[PDB]
Amino acid sequence: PRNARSKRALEKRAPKIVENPKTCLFLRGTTCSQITQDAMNDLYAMRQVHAKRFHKKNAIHPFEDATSLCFFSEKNDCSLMVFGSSNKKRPHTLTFVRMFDYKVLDMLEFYLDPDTYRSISQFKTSKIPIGMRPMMVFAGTAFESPVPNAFTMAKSMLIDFFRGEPSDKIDVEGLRFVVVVTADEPQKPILRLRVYGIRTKRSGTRLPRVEVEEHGPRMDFRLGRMREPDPAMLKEAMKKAKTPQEERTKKNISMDLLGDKIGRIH
Amino acid sequence: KVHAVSRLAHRIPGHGQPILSCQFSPVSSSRLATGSGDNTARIWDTDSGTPKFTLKGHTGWVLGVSWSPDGKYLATCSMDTTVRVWDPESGKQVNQEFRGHAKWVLALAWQPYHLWRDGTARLASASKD
Amino acid sequence: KAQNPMRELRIQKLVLNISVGESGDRLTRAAKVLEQLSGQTPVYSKARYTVRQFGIRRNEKIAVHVTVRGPKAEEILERGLKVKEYELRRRNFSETGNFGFGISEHIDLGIKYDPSIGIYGMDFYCCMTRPGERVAKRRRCKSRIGASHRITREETIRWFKQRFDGIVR
Amino acid sequence: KLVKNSAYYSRFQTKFKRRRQGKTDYYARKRLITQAKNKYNAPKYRLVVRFTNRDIITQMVTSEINGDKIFAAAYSHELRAYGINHGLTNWAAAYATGLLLARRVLAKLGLDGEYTLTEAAETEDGERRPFKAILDVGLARTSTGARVFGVMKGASDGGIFIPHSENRFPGYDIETEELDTEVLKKYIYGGHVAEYMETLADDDEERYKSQFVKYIEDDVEADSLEELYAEAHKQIRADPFRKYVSDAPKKSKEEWKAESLKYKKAKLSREERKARVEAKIKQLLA
Amino acid sequence: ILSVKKNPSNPLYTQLGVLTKGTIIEVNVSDLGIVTASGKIAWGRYAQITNNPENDGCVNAVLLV
Amino acid sequence: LPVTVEKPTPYTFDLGLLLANDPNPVNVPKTTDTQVLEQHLASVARDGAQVLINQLLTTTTITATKDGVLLTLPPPTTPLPREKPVPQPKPETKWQAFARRRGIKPKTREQRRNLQYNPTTGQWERKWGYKGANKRGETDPIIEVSAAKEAMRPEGTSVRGDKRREIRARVKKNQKQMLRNQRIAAEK
């Protein structure tokens, strides 16, 4: 890294105590349906700021060999993946792939309904501004499984996809859009993804009355093939680093409201 | 309801000495009169943040500017022992300067508009003498 | 549609070039000659590559040029064609409509000879445009000139013959 | 050799459509709309300023996923309702258009049942916040004296909080880092155009007539420009939504649909294309 | 006095906090009413000692503004 | 119309991610009518959004600043995986190990400044770098030289490059040590 800009790039790509906002790459296979392309376009419109997009055809089957996926993650520093593909057995597939240290942490397949799918342009409403973080609502009994399963992994993928940039404060005008995922415990259950803009009205008390209006896209999914993480890799990924601003509690030592260090005697 | 001012609207230069007095016109906030130590008073259009008129004629620091209650006159009291009256719509001095004070004229006070009699206004000037 | 007034040929610019090939006093004198010939300060052009045969170096000022527009360009072109006696060659004209020529002496242009400056020749190049050439030059909404609005070799030869009353051989 | 071959055409990657049209700087647009100092999930507004040969277009724009939205718009040809009929592209007409857009934005917001979460969660120690927007000059050059800063100055005087510095206003001196507010006032009320009119009337009479023929025809003296622009500012601040009608022909929307469809001629169908191909084949055979 | 910043003769003298002539010290300037451009209150600034305290019995300083 | 949603099982929240979890079952009707299907889905979404809005407006502190009315959010509590490992201290170099063994303290930032006072010129100069003190006398008009030094000096070489030669030798030794440390750390 002789160049200063290259040094900045490697320092941005370096591991950190507080990680950067998460980047997703949207890519296609050799054969991919137009409905799948529209679905990936809608997801990219949801996640424009922290996404990159490929435009070529890739001869990648993630459940056979994901070496090219790991290479793409290492090259583009992307760590969420949305892989579109189509086949005779599975006509509309969205493969959600999550990295850890430029290797495959876990994978999941979603099967898009071609009949009930409606894009964002199919709804004549006011759309979400670019870069705005929507709120999330997960509904049903499929996300409360005692054992980690496909629905728990899908909930983790969707939360991580719509995570956005974390912040300690939010404007009250940034609470206008909600993404609702509904899924029931059960032949295969239907996972439904909807987005609603929020209209708020008077109700005669302090809290306001909330009304919703569909914003798009309209998506129905069947959960398919799942690649589970290794337990050691999952433990290393779910390790939590401590900020230097998070102090270490010492016995009989505190800080008062004037900033003085105070010791306790007994 | 008057909402709290929170940011700079306009920073307007033009005076060569520190500003010693400022007062808005009673009609609206569009016109603002300031008297400074550069022997002058100045009228400012606050809508565009621009100067409008420069009133010159005093030879001491203009300690006070005061609008008439109807808004048709501007009185300036200065340290050259004088008081001057100006038309703010044209920037011109009305009649001659008010002479008779022996020392610095420090304060001005117009008579209330409903108390005006004999077809004229009255102006009280408090001085160092 | 060929009689439209916006298709009228005109001189875009005239570029005067002196390539002395050696930096220093000779280049300075050539720049001087360009300065009192045009009326504006000239431009020093550096050599792109190193050629040991020509005795040049990279980033070494070897040439000088002036771009002249308006009626001044027409006046300088008139002076140059008066020097060349209104005779050009078919080999000189380009396929894009521009043309040019070269001279070996400049005192015959009307400049009194000064022994402290000396003898210098130069290349004249005239560019031809129609009204509407702003489309390919403006910053915003820059586009390409249409095929029917371009200038051909036959068109510029005809324009030269009808305007300067010269001959082409 | 020939460089525009099949391999080159296949490997070619087109730019964005507006980049090919030369209308949008996406490098500036990405930093304008997707970058923020804080992450409070707040909406962002931009004052888009554009210029034509005969009009000034000022808009208040938010960026959404499917395309931009216009909160309010103002045009310099609407100054005829407020009395400005000439010089609809000069720096003072830019000031008046910016002021008009600022007044229209404030009137639409009501700052001159459905209600907001700000009003829902407003505290006792809360005050009214100004409307905030960032300037979008597009591909224009940001030099001192440019009319984009006149639109910005007019909007800021109308009451829109636009973050800016004063070193690009006319009359600013870079040597002393001071702004000549006398020159600024002269430009605001159009005194540069009046001074040009007086200088032309002194020196070049026929060029004065050719340049300001409409001013003389409408009897607009150079000494009345300041009063005319001040009265225009007062009328704009009084009635920001005054209706204006132009001299163009007026029809309804469906009447213009019929009028434009009368001159639009349709695309050829498959049967007509096959008939033309067969005719071309027969002509080639014959 | 808030702290001793730089004794010009020796870093050991700076560490010991010796107050001699030419020493840069940090002083509390709350009583001077200094407000920054952003609206914050500047209560700590730098001063230079202009006297000899070992000869005078008092410390005299000039603010570095 | 009410602003409170009653469910058999209460909602759970993670206000850092603005996430509301509804463990109650979504009784999707067994009909092919998309209108009533989306009516039910929109009702469930309305209940979730209403309870989330009430939770945000009631259990977060509110500050009205010039930026607007802001809710202060708690840090997120939902476990999600990282994607780069928690950084570890680098392998301890040869100098670092030697200094830890010998009790050699790191220099202070004032001590390691690239600045020194030249008495003879009465000026402040840099110890190294552009016009550094390590290249002193390479550009001054006069250098005296020793007769033995000029006799032992190879032909072509001058005295005006000796300091640069010494600097390049020290720099080469420095990267030799640095590359050895990097290779050993890579093996570790």
Add this chain to the structure above:
RNA sequence: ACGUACGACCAUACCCAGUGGAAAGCACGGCAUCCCGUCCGCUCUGCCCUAGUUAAGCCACUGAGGGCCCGGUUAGUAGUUGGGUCGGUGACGACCAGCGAAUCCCGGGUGUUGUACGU
């Protein structure tokens, strides 16, 4: 439906040529005092919107050659594993599956669309 200003998809939109364009709008344009910037008012910037002009830009349509984008076929086939298997000295010859292509061939097409203001 047409035009303009911001846009979304980012070639069905790109490369080449021809024909036409009511209305208004864009645009070519005219002038260099002031603001501003160049070797050159070429570009940028300022003033005019009067006068000429649809010649070019722009839009629509057509035409080859490319390119590009969709659907079927290829084909559940080559190929890779399970090694489930029936016999077989064992191997092998065959079924049973799980993933899963591409070349070639056929057919269609050469832009949809959001906000605001106008014609």
Add this chain to the structure above:
RNA sequence: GUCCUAAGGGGGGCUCAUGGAGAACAGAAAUCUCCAGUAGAACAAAAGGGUAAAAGUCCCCUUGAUUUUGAUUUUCAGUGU
């Protein structure tokens, strides 16, 4: 063995290598003009999709060469502001 108001950073303007056609000396190779030019140049890295009104190249400003604060993280401190 010579050269530099250093690199870096921010902003703005421009588009490169090459090919064709033109221009006194100038002739494969000097400079200038136009057209075509997905980068085939340059700069970093080792793409299987790096960068084109730029991450390339020149102008304007800074060059102050390693700022201050911290009850917080880690290590140390017989010289613990």
